[PDB]
Each structure stands twice: as structure tokens, then as C-alpha cells.
Amino acid sequence: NKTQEEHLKEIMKHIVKIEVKGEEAVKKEAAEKLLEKVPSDVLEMYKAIGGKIYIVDGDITKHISLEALSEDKKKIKDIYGKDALLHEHYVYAKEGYEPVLVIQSSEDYVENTEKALNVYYEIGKILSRDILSKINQPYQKFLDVLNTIKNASDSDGQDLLFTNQLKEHPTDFSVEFLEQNSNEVQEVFAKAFAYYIEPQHRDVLQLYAPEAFNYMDKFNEQ
Amino acid sequence: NKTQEEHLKEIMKHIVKIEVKGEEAVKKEAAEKLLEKVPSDVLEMYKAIGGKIYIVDGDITKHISLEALSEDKKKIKDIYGKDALLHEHYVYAKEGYEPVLVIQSSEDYVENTEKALNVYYEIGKILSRDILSKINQPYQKFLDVLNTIKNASDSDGQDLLFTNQLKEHPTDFSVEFLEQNSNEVQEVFAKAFAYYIEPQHRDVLQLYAPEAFNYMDKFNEQ
Amino acid sequence: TVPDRDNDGIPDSLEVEGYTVDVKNKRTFLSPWISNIHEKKGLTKYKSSPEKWSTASDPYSDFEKVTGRIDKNVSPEARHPLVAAYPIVHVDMENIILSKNTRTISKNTSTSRTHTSEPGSNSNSSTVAIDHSLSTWAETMGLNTADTARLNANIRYVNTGTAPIYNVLPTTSLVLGKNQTLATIKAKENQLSQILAPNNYYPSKNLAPIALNAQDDFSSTPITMNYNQFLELEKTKQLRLDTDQVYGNIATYNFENGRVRVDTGSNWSEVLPQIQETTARIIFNGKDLNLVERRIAAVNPSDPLETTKPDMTLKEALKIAFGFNEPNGNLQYQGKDITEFDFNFDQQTSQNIKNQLAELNATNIYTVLDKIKLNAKMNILIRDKRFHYDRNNIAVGADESVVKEAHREVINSSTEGLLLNIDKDIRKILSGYIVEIEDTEGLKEVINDRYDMLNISSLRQDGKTFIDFKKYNDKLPLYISNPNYKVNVYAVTKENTIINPSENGDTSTNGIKKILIFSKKGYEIG
Amino acid sequence: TVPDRDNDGIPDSLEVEGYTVDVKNKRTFLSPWISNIHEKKGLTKYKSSPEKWSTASDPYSDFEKVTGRIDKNVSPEARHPLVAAYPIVHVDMENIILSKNETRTISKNTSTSRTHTSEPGSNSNSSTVAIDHSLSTWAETMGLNTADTARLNANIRYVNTGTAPIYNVLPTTSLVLGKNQTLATIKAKENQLSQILAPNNYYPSKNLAPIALNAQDDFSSTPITMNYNQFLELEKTKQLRLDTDQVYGNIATYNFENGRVRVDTGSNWSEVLPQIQETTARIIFNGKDLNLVERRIAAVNPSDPLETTKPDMTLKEALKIAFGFNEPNGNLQYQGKDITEFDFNFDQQTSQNIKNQLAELNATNIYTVLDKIKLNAKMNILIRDKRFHYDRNNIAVGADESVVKEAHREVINSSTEGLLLNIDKDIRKILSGYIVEIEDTEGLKEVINDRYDMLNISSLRQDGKTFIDFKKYNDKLPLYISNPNYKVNVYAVTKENTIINPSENGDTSTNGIKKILIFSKKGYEIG
Ligand SMILES: [Ca+2]
Ligand SMILES: [Ca+2]
Ligand SMILES: [Ca+2]
Ligand SMILES: [Ca+2]
């Protein structure tokens, strides 16, 4: 039974600050904190294949390592499947022989879980392709869990991870779809990845998509 | 919440004595206790240059190791800058090829912080000159902190450490003053030293002269 | 690990150097002040005592205040650590009825909160003015020398302070003359279980008032006057309420569920006397000629704990306490420049000021308000110059000139009266009007030659006032005999108002100080 | 670590050698005395007992005082560890009314003043009431037959002239007539008025209605009654006496955790007062306004170890810290007034002590040795203005003819209707009234008011000055001036030279009353 004083110390600890690194510094620090959640297991493998992590300000489109590449891809969708204009976002991975990730800097990266979730999502892509696309085959290991989600009571799991397409594909999943569509199959991996990583969105995955979590849990730790 | 009995033990411990070494012994013991506050770091260096520590009784002027030397220096000022007649004091350092310190013996060396402060002061001189005067140069290290005191808000620091002269010297301190006046510059070192050493007068220094303390703190421990 | 000596929750360094509270992403943020950043956002720079849990010496901590974790009824201005949060309750009498213990009298009363030329008193008081207009008193009541008068009235408690009151009401003394205590008014039930928030009435204006000796009640102690007292009451038409400062316990904030309950271990009685000894008091009748008292945390040089407070200037106090502002260098209160207000000090505070001004090589105070330091126990009074004040610091007069400008703007002149737009702050120092018709040689005839027939003025939902000539001209419009010689009208100031016939028993209007506000020959103009 | 024997918050060495509280960067700081730093800042050098949580034996610790962590109502002077903080409450009667126990009643204004006892201690404070004897016979106007019985009522206020406040309690007061005729016992109603009587304040405050013995609104109140004989004595003396005890209730204490100051139910004035009175030297001083102001300073008691542990206290020092004296240029004085302008009076024992000190000092004049004179617990010293003449209660009842005239030496606007002049408040106290006689050119005199009770012509004017009114007792008419040649004289009477009753004869004349010439003008342009 915490006394009133004890409660005061708790809230003051949350509310009272002293030394401040200044806007700019905080921005950088915030970003760093995000990566700390991501297991270095993948980070090292990103730089290994020539991976660059940038934390620019303002519009991302307005960057040096990234100029005006295909205005088409500047139309995007968030981790929820809703559209968005790249110049207004805060994160993006780059598909090329020289893979590179760049993000905006904000105080919100410690307040807004939505943002972090979307950046872990992008990282999910990087892995699902820029690190998995290589020696994916036989690939059946993950292929089999994706099926359980398609055919099973409760659409939730596939309303959470699947696009407005795979859901409506009547037939069960052919072990050829992954070939024709390595794109979609890795978006899923990216999403499930984001949710598992984002600490608060983790249990959500364990609940709505027990299998996707059941796998992503084993996957990393071993 | 100490019971009444517990408080009684506290005060009795302060008030009740038993075995007594006798006046004379107490006098000596008292003096010893003072030196114990001074870090041997300097004591050894004093005897190293031929340093002698005496604890005589009555008038100090009336001593063997010190007869009638320049009646002029028998006019002195305390750590506060107030005049005093040597034959009435209780401490004094000797400037010569054979440096030597002598002090009166009293019960007051454990009661009166004023006295101790004045004796640590004298010791401060011994160092500032009889141990520093040697390899002082370039000497800029301390020279730079003395400046911060001169020019800065709050005269207190210089009302505490400076003489009625350096305070009124309009111009900032020339890196030549220390030469022409190694005398004054070391009096300060002696004073700041005394305050830092005297345990209860320490925080006073940290407050009124944060820099003088900030230095004397580092200085000794390293 | 960071020094928070007073345990209020704000590190010492911040309280002394300056801090502010900001909400970013719906989260509270208390951080050091940074001009370029916070000024933009219109935030407030706070300074406070690191050795006072409550700088203003009130029941709310500096942290609770600036952060909103507090009784929501604590006035906005009192959310500033340097502005004291305490109740200022006084009694408001609306109507009064006198009877012989029909044949009774029912008059409307105008009670106003007063201020003491005296020092402290640990009490607030108000003065009641009884309507002397038409409906003799003792006559209508048929009071024989051996009679005895009964008294009763309807009242409301009003809190003009910065903190609320719970479940308790102050004891009030009804005083006649200098020290004739007629009655002692306490609250019934001992615990009404209600609340009197700052800036509110109790009971609220939409509810029935409180009556001394209620109808439904029968045991209530009747208020009685003797023949002589009644005579004085009629001679003066004025009473006085002396309300104490027993405000009961304080509603405190709880850090577990945000609940605000009355702390039985926290009492206004033990906190008020500390506020009064550590704060500078400023009284200001600028909002509506009503005396509003505020207290600011000011340093006391001889008291260490107190010299640990932020330095407070006269200009600053006015901003944070009464909501003054300097839009373009000019300090003002809602368009009204400071130069429109007088400064009045008690003896000691006055002497202090002089020494400051002298040491400032300044003569004009209005040009040095940001340099004038406030000290605990200072008493400052700020009034509108436009008016004359009495002993209670109430607007009861003004210079002839200012009144005229107010009346100068006429809207319509007939013989049924006068219609014009006049400031509301003027209608406060006016008891009514008297109108005479002057000949071409100087023959003047007052159309209502009684001291209690000046109430011809009447308000209007329009917002403008209309002087009625019919009222005391026997319902009929002003009959002009010759449109050549003029009709004169002039207002009577409250300090010059007469409520009882002369020693002669004379009811005439003459002798009464009046102030010209009209004159038209009568023809087309009139 | 560092010894704090009494656990007051101050180390021992500091309390004995000297210390002070300074504020740097809006942060309190308790430091050893450092002349070169602290004297500049006008700070005060403190000394106090290391073995007394409260050197003055009052409810507040030496630390709480010097630091400000205390009830803010504790007088500034009592923030000094060597000056006691305690209440000194006495009752002040303003007006009195006497009637025949069921007009014809009497209403007189009363002037009550706090007194001091040539006696030792008494654990009580008292005041004497003086009833106005001016015009409005008493028993006659009241029609009191030998078998009658008089009723009494009055308006009073409690006044605290001490250094500490009082909460929720008022002392019991005895209304005494003659030597020991206790007329009534005055207690506070409700048992808990829930108010405060701070030092230097009245209760109720002067802006509020006074307290009445047997209130109108109250009916059960016990009526105060005198018999025929008592009333006669009351009229013969025109004087009563209030004996107020020292039941001041509980003490408001400071609470560090939140700085709250609540009444400590476990702390009572009754258990602390008798300790103050036995460890302190008492000094009474009527220098501020001829009003007796009592103060107590912590003085050593040589026979008592705990007490000999206190700082040494001299007469000069006590005066500085207690009554705010000062020596601007070597000269000890109280607001320009040099010490030599004041008398010293001691009780027996303290007097003997002083003599021994002076003797041992080879000094005869005390004024030249105040810094050498030691104070001791239980000393009683009285310091009064030499100019004035005091009664047996040490109350200014008059002065020297020369000084009186000196005050009226400043005329303003003379007329035939009355005189007006700004007159020193100090003297007004010792004055009962004035008399004005018309003198012929040959030496005849015709006093305009030849009664002992027609002196109340002086009236304070809110402008800040006094106005004498000839009209008052001249049938509302201006003093008629037959011949502007022979002068019309005007002069006041001292309170000790004041007559309140008709002489043995029944003579009501003004003659016989010793007076002091303060005005005389031929009458013409001069008059
Ligand atoms: Ca704090
Ligand atoms: Ca604070
Ligand atoms: Ca101590
Ligand atoms: Ca002590």
C-alpha cells in the first residue's frame, strides 16, 4: 500500500526532467532506442550485405542516398494496409544491390508505438527479402504455418497479417504461390515480424495469430 | 524514534568521562588530533625538507628553536585579516633554510574550530611557499582559477580569500603578478587550504568560493 | 539524487532558476525554462522556493499547482506558486424586513465588500445600504417608545477568493453603528454538506436565499431592536456584516486515483495566518469597482526561509495576480492603462516604497513598476482615479467634470424624461437625479423636492438608462409653460446623498450637492 | 561525525563560537560566523547553548528560529535564540456602563494600561482601568438608594504584547475592586472560539466589535453586581483592575515534511512558561510609546550547570537584540534617543547584584559600562523615560512643566472658537485635559470652565492633530472677548494633578488644580 509520498516520487520520476541534450540530440537518441529492441542478430547481417542506416530530418524523399527513384513507389501503404504519401512518412527500406534504410527523427519514437511498429515493419521486409530471398528454399518451414492461418476458424489472424487478396483466394495455398508471389509472402513475414518485435503489440500477435507468433518466437531465439 | 533512555546514553557519552590522562597529556593529545586531519601527503614532505613540529606552552615567542627574530613579524593577522600580537597567539611557521612549525597546547583544539582553522592556515603557507615556491612554474594551473574569483558575480569568494588589495586591483590579473607578488598569491592558497581542511569550514568554501574548493578538492586526492 | 529540499517534487535548481509545465503528446512535462522554445508556445515561466513545499504558504504544493493535480475549484491565477490560494468569504444582504415585535417595511439592500485602513483582522466584512426611497418608517410601523422592533432579511455567502470552501460556513456578526452587535449568524445543521467555490454565491443566484430566522423554522432566535436602535437604523440606513475566517477543512488531491477529498487533518485555520505573514497584499477595484484582494509571495529580508523566494516586482505581481498585461510596452488592465489607477499604501509599506523610489532616483512610480520590489506584509490598494472613495474604499463620488462627459452623450430629450448611454461604473456612484425648471430670470422649480425621490433613473435590458419625468410629476409628462426658459437636470453623488430629513424635519431637495448634466431652453431643443 | 548534543540541528562548535543563517542562490545555509563576509550582508551573529534544544527554554528550537522554519507570527526579535518567544496577554477595557439592577444609566470611556509589579513573579499579567470622570452625580443620576444594588457591564479586548501567538484559547481574567474585592471572573465563551491572538494585536481586532461582559444577544450570562458600598468605593476611586492568568492553551508547531504549522496537542504553554521565567532575565521598557513592553533574554545561572552553558549576555547586548537599540556612532540609543534619557530600576536582588558588579568594576556610572554588566537568570530590570512621572504601577501620569510647554510651542491656527496644533503623541498620554481662563489687564481671572470635570475639551482629529474646543463648555458659543487687550490664558493639566471628585467641601471649582501654562495672548490681532 504505497503512501501518498511514494506515489509522488513515482509520478515525479515520469514528469520531472533536468539536463536536456537539446532537440537534435533527443531525435537521434530516440531512433537509437528503437534499434535496441531489434536483435543485433539481423543488424550485423544487414551491414554484412552492405547495409546503411540513416536518420534524416524532414521529408525523406529529400535525401542524398535517395533521390528521385520511381515516383510510383512513393505511393505506399502502412502496416495496416492504408495508403500514404512517402514524403509525409518517416521510414523506408531500399531495394537494390546496395540495400539501405533511412528514417525521420522524432520525439514520437518513444511515445508513438504506431510509428515504431511501422519501422519494424519495414525492417521485416529487409529480412523477408534482402536477407531471406537468398537461401529461402526449400522454404517449406514457414510455408506450412502460413497455411494454418488461411484455413481455420477465426479470420482475425488473416485479417491481421493477410492482404485483401490472399484472404479471398478460395483454394488452399499452393507450394508454387511463394514463387509467383515471393512479394506478398514476405510482406506477411514483415508484418508478423513487426508485431512480435514491438513489445506491446507482441501479445496481440500471440492472441489473434497464435501460429504466426508461435513461429516468430522460436525463429529468433533459435 | 529514540526512547528517553536511548537519548540519555547519547548525552552521557558526551558528558561523562572516567580515566583522565591529566592536563599536560590532554594538551599533547589535542594537538595530535589536529594533524590527523592534515593528509600525511604534506607532513612527510615537510620533514623531507627538514621540518620540525613543536607543541610548546605559554608564549610562543619564548622558545628555544625560536628566539627574538625580527620584532616586525611579531605583528600578525589571523585568517580573517585582523591584527594580532604573536606572544598571544598559538601557532606560527618559520621562513628559513631550516623550516619549522611550533604551536601552543590547549584543550581548545577540539572545541574551537577558529584556532584549528588558523593553524591549518599557517600550514597552508608552509605548502604555498616552503613546498610550492620551488617548482611552482609554469604555475598557470592555479593561476587560472584565481582569476575566476576576481572577475565574477558575488564578491563573497574574494571577500573570503582575497586581501583588501587584490580585491581593489581594477585590472584583471596579469600573469606577472604572481612573480612580483608570490607573497599574496600564496596567502590565498594558504587560506583556501585552511577552509578546505577544517571539516566544518569546508562546505563554506564550496559555497562562497566554489572554484577555490573545486580545485583544492581535486588537488589533494589526485 | 537531485536536491528537492521541500519535497514538493520540483528539484531545487528548477525552482530557483526557472521552469515550466508543457504537455507533449498528451503527456505532462516539467522542464527548465528555455525562452526561444517556450515563449513561442505561450507557456508560463515559473519560479518558486526550493525550501517551501508551498511557496505561498497555502495548502497546495508548487508541484500540485503548476501541474494541475489539485482541487479544480482553485482559481486559475492561484495555480501560480507565487499566488496564494485561499477563500475570502463575506455575506451579501439582498432584502430586509422590519416589523413591530402589514404595518411592516420591506426595503432592498445594497451590500458591498469593504477594505480596512486598519491592518489585518483575520476577518472579512461588508457594509449594507438600505433603500431610502418611497413605498415614515416608525410611523408606518406604529412604534411606540416602549415598543420593540423585529428584524429579518435574506442573505447569501459569496467567495471572492482563490480557493473553495466545503461543508462549513463562517460565523457572521450583524453590527449597528460602531459596535452594537444585533445578532450572530451561524450556519444550521452544522454541516450543510455543500460547496462555496471561488467567484460563486451560496446559495446560487438561481436558488432561494438564506433567511435569518426561516419561516419553516420556529425555534430560531428572533432578531430584536429597541426603539432607540431602530431610530439610529433609520437615521443611518446602514448595517455591517463582520464575517470571520472559520472555513473548515481543505479538499486535498490524492496521488492514487486523483480523488479530491476533504482532508480532516488539513485546516484553513492553521494555514491562513502563515499566508498573511509571508505575502504582499494587493487590492484592486478595476474589474467593476469591487474590491478584489489578492496575495503574492514576497521576500522577507530578515527571514532566511523567506528570502529564498523568487524576487517579486510590482509590475509582475499585477500580471500574475490580476491579469494585467503589456501589449506594446504599456502595462494595462483590459485596455485601461495603469496611469488610470491610484496607488495607496499603509504606513510601513508606504515608507518602504519611498526609500525604494529615493534610492531609485525616481519620482514617478508609474515609470518604475518593474523596479519596485515587494516584501511580505506589504499592503497596496489600487483604485480607479475617476472616483472619490470613502473610509471603506467604496466608490461613492467623483469630480464634477467626469460625470458630465458620461452624461454629455445624450440620445433623446423629451418631456417624458431623458434617454442616453452612460458607463456602468458611473451608475455606481449615483443615487439618482433631480430636475428643476428654470425661468428666463432665474426662477427654478424642482419637480420632486424630496430627498427620497431621486430614484427616477431606471436600468433597461437594452443596456442603456432612461430618466423618467412622469414618475414624480404625478404620472404626467413635464408641462412646459414657456419653451423659452430651460429645463435643468443634474445627478446626485452617493457621498452627497441625503437619506434623512434635516434637523428641521425638512424634506426639501435644496442644499443637496448636485452636478449639472443638462440644460435646454425648452423649445425645439428641449 | 559532528556533535549536536541537543539535537537542534546546529553543531556544538557553532552555537558556542558564533554562527548565522545566510541565503545564497535562493538556498538557506547555516555557516560559522565569518566577519569579512557576513557583517557586510547585515547578517546577525548568533550564539546559543549546545545543550539546550531551545536556549531560551521556549517551544521553538534555536535552529527553527534562526532559519525561519517556524510559526510566522513569532515576533522578529524572538527569532533570536537568546530572546524568549512567549505570549503576554492582558485585557483592555474601552467603555463601561453602570445601571440599577432591575436611561438613569452611566456610560463612561475607560483607559486601561498594562502594569508591572514591584512584586516578584506572579504567573499572571494585569492591567489597571481608569474611568472617565468628565461631564455627561453618578449615584444621583442613577437614583441609588442605600438599599439598592448596582449592575455592571463593559466592552473589552484581549491584547498580546508578547513574542508568540495564541490559538483557540483565552486566559481567565478577574475583575478586582479595591485590594481584593473580586467582582467577576471573565472566561471565554464556547470554550473554543477558534481564533488567533498574534503578538502586537488585539482580539477582536480594532476594526471589529469589542467583547461585552454579558452580551445583549446572550441572556443566561451571569450579571455583574455591586452593593451600595462597593459602588461608593468604585466612585471614590474611579479605578478597577484586571488580573489575567497564563492559560494560553496549546502551541502551533512547525512540521518539516510539508512545512505545515499545526497546533501540537502535546505541546502546551503551561508547561513551558515556568521554565522561561526561571532561566531568563526580564527587561521592561516603556520607550516606544510610554507603554510597558516586557521582554526576556536567556541569561546564565552560575549555580546551574545546564544554564552556565548559555552564551554570556551583557545589558547592552540584551537591549540591542530585545528592544532593537543600536549604536550608530558609539552611542547606544533607541531611535535617536540616547540611553542617558532612561532610568534603570531593579528589584531588590537584581539591584544588589548590579552594585556588586559596579563595585567590582570600579565604576560608579552604569551608563558608561553597559557592555560590561552581566545579566543573570531571574534578573528584573525596568527602563523608563526620565522626562515623565510614573505612578506606583510605572505608568506615565505626568511630566515637567518645561517639557509640556515645549510640545505646545508649535501653534498652527488659533481662533476664538478653539485652538489647533500638531502635538507629540507621547505627551497626550499624560494629559487629562485643559482649562482656559480670561485674565483682566489688572490681574483678574475668569475660567470659562470652573469644574473639575469640564477638562475634556481636547479631541483628536483624524487629520493627525488635536483640536481644543472653547464652545464645548461655553454654551456652544465662541469665547467672548470684551477687551482684546487683557490676555486670555489657556493651559493643560497633568494626569497626576487631575482631580476626579468634588473636594471635602463639595467645591467643584477649578482652582486648586495644579496646571501648566501653555498659552496666553492679549486678544487682538495676537489673539
Ligand atoms: Ca522542490
Ligand atoms: Ca517549492
Ligand atoms: Ca545544537
Ligand atoms: Ca541549542
Side-chain angles (χ1 to χ4, degrees), chain C residues 279-320:
Chain C
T279 62
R281 178 171 62 176
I282 304 186
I283 309 185
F284 176 64
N285 76 346
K287 184 174 187 182
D288 52 337
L289 268 45
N290 284 335
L291 300 170
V292 168
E293 162 183 318
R294 250 51 167 178
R295 288 190 170 272
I296 298 82
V299 162
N300 184 337
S302 69
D303 188 322
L305 221 198
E306 304 308 322
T307 77
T308 213
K309 294 173 161 183
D311 295 312
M312 177 61 49
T313 67
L314 224 192
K315 174 200 283 291
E316 190 64 5
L318 298 174
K319 283 190 172 185
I320 69 182

Side-chain angles (χ1 to χ4, degrees), chain D residues 232-250:
Chain D
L232 292 190
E233 183 178 13
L234 187 279
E235 185 175 9
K236 287 189 173 186
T237 64
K238 302 289 200 300
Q239 162 169 312
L240 290 172
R241 179 165 65 101
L242 292 319
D243 291 326
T244 298
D245 67 17
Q246 292 188 302
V247 294
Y248 299 156
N250 298 326

Side-chain angles (χ1 to χ4, degrees), chain C residues 346-360:
Chain C
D346 72 46
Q347 189 184 33
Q348 296 182 259
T349 171
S350 179
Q351 187 61 34
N352 183 323
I353 301 296
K354 289 178 54 181
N355 303 12
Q356 302 206 39
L357 287 169
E359 188 153 346
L360 275 166

Side-chain angles (χ1 to χ4, degrees), chain C residues 4-12 15 50:
Chain C
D4 181 28
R5 297 186 179 188
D6 54 19
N7 303 119
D8 57 16
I10 306 175
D12 298 11
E15 299 210 76

Side-chain angles (χ1 to χ4, degrees), chain A residues 4 11-12 15-17 112, chain C residues 2 9 11 25 30 69 253:
Chain A
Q4 192 180 359
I11 186 56
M12 78 169 299
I15 290 190
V16 71
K17 288 299 194 64
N112 296 18
Chain C
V2 189
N25 285 42
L30 188 154
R69 292 171 164 72
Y253 179 89

